[PDB]
Amino acid sequence: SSSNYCNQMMKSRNLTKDRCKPVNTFVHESLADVQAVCSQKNVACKNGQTNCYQSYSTMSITDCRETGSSKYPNCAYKTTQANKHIIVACEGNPYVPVHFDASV
């Protein structure tokens, strides 16, 4: 919990206020373009279930991963920015992303 994007955003979005979460990805694309992936390339999810979808294009993402030296209360994150295809699992109506399955 210091100044770097992952430590800041993980805190603000209530992911590390009461625990240190090991890894989390943030997508820097408009919400409706991320929701548009639910009608893009259908693929199997890691768990075999088939409600996962892979984006046609790469998207700007930041991976946040806890350092070996991180301990609650002072979570610490390595920040890695990349452009990757995201795979999300979709449910509901409207069919919207409910889980991040990976980036590729």
């Binding site: 943030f26 820097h28 408009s30 991320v34 449910e91 919207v96 992303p97 409910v98």
Partner: peptide
């Protein structure tokens, strides 16, 4: 309370 779709957005969207 928070739906699974709202939770995906709070945890992963940075539009």
């Amino acid at each position: 309370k928070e739906t699974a779709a709202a939770k995906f957005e709070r945890q992963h969207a940075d539009s």
